[PDB]
Design a protein around this ligand. Sequence first.
Ligand code: NAG
Ligand code: NAG
Ligand code: NAG
Ligand code: CA
Ligand code: CA
Ligand code: CA
Ligand code: CA
Ligand code: CA
Ligand code: CA
Ligand code: CA
Ligand code: CA
Ligand code: CA
Lengths: 397, 132, 48, 265, 265, 272
Amino acid sequence: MDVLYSLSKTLKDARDKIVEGTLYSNVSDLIQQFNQMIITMNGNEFQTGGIGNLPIRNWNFDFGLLGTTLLNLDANYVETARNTIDYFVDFVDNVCMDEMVRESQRNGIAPQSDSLRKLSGIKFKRINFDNSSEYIENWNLQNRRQRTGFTFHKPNIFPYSASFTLNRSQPAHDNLMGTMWLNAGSEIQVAGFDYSCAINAPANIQQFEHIVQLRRVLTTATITLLPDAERFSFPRVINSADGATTWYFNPVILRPNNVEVEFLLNGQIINTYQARFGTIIARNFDTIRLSFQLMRPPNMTPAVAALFPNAQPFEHHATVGLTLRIESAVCESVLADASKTMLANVTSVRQEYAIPVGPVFPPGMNWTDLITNYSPSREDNLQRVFTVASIRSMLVK
Amino acid sequence: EYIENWNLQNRRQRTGFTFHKPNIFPYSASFTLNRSQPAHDNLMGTMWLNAGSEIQVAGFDYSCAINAPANIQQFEHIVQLRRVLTTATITLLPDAERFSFPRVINSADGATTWYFNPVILRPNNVEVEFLL
Amino acid sequence: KSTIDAAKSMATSVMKKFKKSGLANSVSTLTDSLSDAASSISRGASIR
Amino acid sequence: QNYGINLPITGSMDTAYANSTQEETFLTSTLCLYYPTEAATEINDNSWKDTLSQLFLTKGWPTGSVYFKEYTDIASFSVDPQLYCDYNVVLMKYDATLQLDMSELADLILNEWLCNPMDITLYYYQQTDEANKWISMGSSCTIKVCPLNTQTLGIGCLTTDTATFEEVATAEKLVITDVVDGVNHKLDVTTATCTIRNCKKLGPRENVAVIQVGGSDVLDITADPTTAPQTERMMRINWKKWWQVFYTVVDYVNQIIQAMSKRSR
Amino acid sequence: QNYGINLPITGSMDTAYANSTQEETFLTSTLCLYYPTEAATEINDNSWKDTLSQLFLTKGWPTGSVYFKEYTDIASFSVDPQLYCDYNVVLMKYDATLQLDMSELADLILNEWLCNPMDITLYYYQQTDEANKWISMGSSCTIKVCPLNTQTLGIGCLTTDTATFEEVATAEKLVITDVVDGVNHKLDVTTATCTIRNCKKLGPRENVAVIQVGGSDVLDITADPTTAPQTERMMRINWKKWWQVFYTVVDYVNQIIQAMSKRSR
Amino acid sequence: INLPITGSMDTAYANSTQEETFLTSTLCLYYPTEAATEINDNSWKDTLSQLFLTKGWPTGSVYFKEYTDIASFSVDPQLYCDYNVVLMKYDATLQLDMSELADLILNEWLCNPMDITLYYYQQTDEANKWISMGSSCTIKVCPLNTQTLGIGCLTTDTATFEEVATAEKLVITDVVDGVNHKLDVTTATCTIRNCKKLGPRENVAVIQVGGSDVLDITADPTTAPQTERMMRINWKKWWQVFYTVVDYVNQIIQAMSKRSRSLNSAAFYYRI
Ligand SMILES: *[C@@H]1O[C@H](CO)[C@@H](O)[C@H](O)[C@H]1NC(C)=O
Ligand SMILES: *[C@@H]1O[C@H](CO)[C@@H](O)[C@H](O)[C@H]1NC(C)=O
Ligand SMILES: *[C@@H]1O[C@H](CO)[C@@H](O)[C@H](O)[C@H]1NC(C)=O
Ligand SMILES: [Ca+2]
Ligand SMILES: [Ca+2]
Ligand SMILES: [Ca+2]
Ligand SMILES: [Ca+2]
Ligand SMILES: [Ca+2]
Ligand SMILES: [Ca+2]
Ligand SMILES: [Ca+2]
Ligand SMILES: [Ca+2]
Ligand SMILES: [Ca+2]
């Protein structure tokens, strides 16, 4: 795989640096590397494809090295370079497309797309130029075990979950207490609602707690925490648990009091935030605990006192919300983001060439069902296909 | 990336610019009424805000589909982009926000106004189709 | 076992109870649903 | 100008609010009041109409755009109300014994009914929806109904002995009958002095405005006993004289006409 | 199958809506109307119950599910009511002179009360919250109350002289008494004829539905004067006959059963 | 509730809910007129209440409800309290009546009405019985065959019917579950109801004041159980009985528990 990355990098740097008129003092090293790669390739015959609509292509390499006699560059050199580079580029693209689509539970790190098993040999080791990218660097680190890290902007670590929980329920759904949550991508919008505004509760206070458990640890996370969740702050008609009947929800937004956000790791607490809103930090955490309260306003004007009566009708339901967005983050393992196209490339290749479902990835590679069960085999195959997708994107975006 | 795609286009090839949150939609806030009256008291229609990289569409019926057949009303919105896109990573959610609270909107001709007091339900039979 | 005593038409006897049950009513419901789905195209496959 | 069809309308949210069509709608429209005889009786003046017209003239309504149309009593008004104007107001006195009739009047004028005829000697009729009612007008309507079963036989009544029928009205000038929707009814009616019509309640008429003059709000337009709504053009006042009422109407005629809206049909 | 425990429930929002449990809840439930004798008198028939049942049969309610239970008067009904069905409808005639009586009846049946007994001659009772009221039923209740001070002496009343007490109820069949909460009262009651019980108001009863057949909506369920609410199962009609009222109830029964829901307890 | 409950064996035994249930509950004794007569006092109720006030039960929580006789009490017993104690005098001639009373109050019944004249009923399971209450019940029954005709009785001649109860105020009747019976009952004086036996009622406590423990709640003659809240005293007076009850009320409430099903004032639930 390292040699695949090195191939892609030297070909990218060739199509970039090798241009008419330029100075051989800038591409002497890359030309020695290109000649070395040509020498290491000449005499081999690869095959690619045969799974799905992928055509079965056979690659033969018989090329000629690039002269070092020149002191400035010209078109009769660039054009040879280009007619030699296009073939390697098509080869690399077809290899990456034959590698993004294959799976295995037994040592998914170990390469599929047997052309790549061949490139992993010892004679192809003379092609390594520089393993400088984030994904290939972390690959090498994992092979030589060390503390890795992938940096993410708005990571999609939360599977889509949009659900409620009622700690006081009735058939008519007229006096309720509960919490609603939407956890999607990088965002958590939670809202605890009491229909009686905490009138019968002790101290005129009603507790609410939301526990979130991440499937992979995160570090150095920048978080934006605000009150008054938006998507659960307007009228609504929701179903019951069993879906038979429906209930109404007319909210009135109040502020969380005694709010406490705890970012924990293995049940031990790491970071704690009391009544701090805005931009906050979390240095290591696999668990989030958002514990807030609904406090009945002791002093009330007429217009608001006419909404929270001492009787059951309760045509206005007091709510206490919280939005929490993980803007930046760092993860030992690989995820998806709002910044990179790796997952898009993978899924597009698979949808285009009609790859059947395998023993590891779910159908269509839906991030919800692929993060909800993030088992080591899935994580390995996902790292592999994301790495080769990055490799392919370096050349054909 | 820019000079590379420039050189590619000069030497014709399949280029690509990788965009994060692309401003491809022109700002368009607008409604469409398929059953209207002068007093605007029983309406059926769809309202959309297409801005930058996001869309928020919402279909409203004032009768909650009581007279419609099978107690169901259909809404469709067809966004026709100006340029093609590829490898799009998209985030779809229900219950659009900015069309979910009381509003006072003018009619087409800007002559009279009408009120809109919503109650959000979930969209069923939802279908998102990306076409080329 | 013994054709116990000069019984009535047993096919009719069993059928007059058979066509009141979950099985037959579900058959009728299924056929009606298929016919109703075939009938109209403007409904839009409203069964989700 | 595609009439007879209904097409998708479109617009935007960047267009600005246009000018005030008030001071032009008053000029190109007409306003008809419907007062009771008791008002002019108490007043005892011959020029009160010209007075109210010269007063409207300050609010903008020109001289010959206002019309007054008397009615001796709520029942005589309920007898074939023919409201043909561009903005109608109806001042209605309260009487606890007339509650049902002055609610039927509201349910008849506030809304827009699509009325088909009826012939009792030949057919037996049934209702299809909850808004397909039977409205009977005339001087004295005495309506009796006998529901029928699946096999065209009565239920607690006989299809010959009209005395066994079930009575819903007794000498009423206006009646609005709703029955069980799904059963055929045989009817007895005083056809000579009353006409019955099978009518479907469509969307409401935004062209009239009822103003109760006395007691608390009681009008249950919607026949179903769950809504009991109070529409926007269902006004209340408390009275001891009539000049104060007419001055109130004239001073707040703009809010009234804002609550009303020129018809669609 | 846990009983007597309140456990957190959980669900989702991508779950689809199930089918209409109506046309099965009718078959698997029971309905009980409570009409006044004036209805039967005006009707002047003896097959009207079977007629209404045959009508209901067209709405889905089978024959042996609907019941009609007569009550001579609002107060007689108020004397020890026992509403034991799966859906109760009550047709209440309006009477200005019975306003508080038919408000107390509503507050009694619409809501669900947790009742303990009272031994006046032994103990001196007090209210703790705004829900612990004292409801007294019987033929003629005559209640008097003396609030006491810190040292169990009277406040403007003499513990011995029963006549010095403050009469709050004079010969009533149903009384619902709310007094100052936080003081110890001593009562005089005609216990030979009336039984009084200290009852704490729980959440509402969703099984019964009151229908004021006549005048405006006056029922003040909540004893406190600030709210004065109106719920979904508190309906209103305007009437001149009773056949029309029963036809309306029948035709809009599904709306009523939508406004109602079976009891939690 | 159809959901599960979960727990752990490492948790701690919490403090005593006694000394707070006494404050937020009510107790109600049912004594016979014989007791007040033997006592010959008027303030004995306030006495017992002031004594309970030492044991923790506050002033306005204890109640006393006189019942002239076991049968008059069995006629529509309306137990409406959070804790009920019953003192029950033994009498051989009343054994079955005070066993039916026990089966009625100690257990939780779900009753439907029974129309004798238009319909005919049968019992399905061993918990579906026919209970009749009133001033003088007399029940006769004729079981029928597959073709709707009698069995050793005539559908018309009411005298042919088989008499199961005579001159009884409360009757609990269990017949062969699976045949259709035709009944003859003094409907004018006794109402009869088809009642299913649900789980027990942990709110009442019967105390047989005299003879040995004879109450056979379960109609099947194979269990003859002795529940926890089925007590026995030996008596020569009533003051000693009441003092015993007051001094050992804590054990009684430890033997009882507040109801689980729902709130209701009578001795059974009604579902039409
Ligand atoms: C609209 O109103 C403004 C403000 O009164 C006025 O200046 C303008 O002339 C009006 N428009 C027209 C077309 O008259
Ligand atoms: C679902 O509800 C509709 C409307 O009442 C009904 O026609 C249909 O039979 C129901 N479905 C089933 C499976 O019964
Ligand atoms: C429970 O009892 C123990 C032992 O007397 C006592 O220390 C503790 O405070 C009690 N619990 C509470 C909540 O007071
Ligand atoms: Ca009338
Ligand atoms: Ca109707
Ligand atoms: Ca008749
Ligand atoms: Ca009263
Ligand atoms: Ca109080
Ligand atoms: Ca005094
Ligand atoms: Ca007995
Ligand atoms: Ca015999
Ligand atoms: Ca049995």
